[PDB]
């Protein structure tokens, strides 16, 4: 039956989401921190979307990567038509959800992906970081503190639940995030920030020797 088929599809999607590297995103004093478990040096699961909007994903690389590209596309055209400060994390979070739902209903296989869109305030302004999680069906959830995506999310989510502290510095939030992620080695870690203090482009990767010194 159709209902049975739908249930099977949901189970398949869940399985796909489960067998994947884990990513975390959490708010800290200077903005938002993305920490993903990533062995490759070329393939990335964290990306700039717009001036103050970042993006992390977990699942099947070609698909989440494809969404990455679609999201980049929409923001630039919108900004050119109206302006940079008009594109918000909210509008982008919304677009992905609608697209995912329609796509799943009309396509063959559902995207085994889990998305997190992050936004911080502009330069010289005060506002709390916003985290949204978009799931494979189109559901969207507003997160106040942290998002955990891919793999087994329960232990990481609980460890973060005990260790999280608002207004933690960059080093403390990195320790908390790596610790809860372990529930690792300097190599194979993809770390980036949405630094609210930057004048325009807030996204900034933290790689190599500096990262080693921090950890």
């Amino acid at each position: 039956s159709p209902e049975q088929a739908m249930r099977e599809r949901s189970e398949l999607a869940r399985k796909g989401i489960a067998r994947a590297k884990s990513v975390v995103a959490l708010a800290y004093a200077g903005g938002v921190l993305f920490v993903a478990e990533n062995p490759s040096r070329s393939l990335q699961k964290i990306s700039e979307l717009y001036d103050r909007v970042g993006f992390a994903a977990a699942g099947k690389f070609n698909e989440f990567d494809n969404l990455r590209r679609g999201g980049i596309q929409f923001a630039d055209t919108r900004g050119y038509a109206y302006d940079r400060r008009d594109v918000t994390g909210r509008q982008l979070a919304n677009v992905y959800a609608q697209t995912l739902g329609t796509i799943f209903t009309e396509q063959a296989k559902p995207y085994e992906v889990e998305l997190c869109v992050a936004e911080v305030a502009h330069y010289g302004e005060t506002k709390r970081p916003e985290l949204y999680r978009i799931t494979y069906d189109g559901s969207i959830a507003d997160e106040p503190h942290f998002v955990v995506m891919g793999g087994t999310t329960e232990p990481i989510a609980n460890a973060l639940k005990e260790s999280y502290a608002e207004n933690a510095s960059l080093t403390d939030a990195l320790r908390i995030a790596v610790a809860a992620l372990r529930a690792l080695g300097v190599a194979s870690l993809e770390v980036a920030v949405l630094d609210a203090n930057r004048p325009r482009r807030a996204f900034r990767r933290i790689t190599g020797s500096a990262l080693q010194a921090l950890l």
Binding site: A97, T135, D137, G138, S139, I140
Partner: peptide, 4 residues
């Protein structure tokens, strides 16, 4: 999901 996301019933409303």
């Amino acid at each position: 999901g996301q019933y409303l």
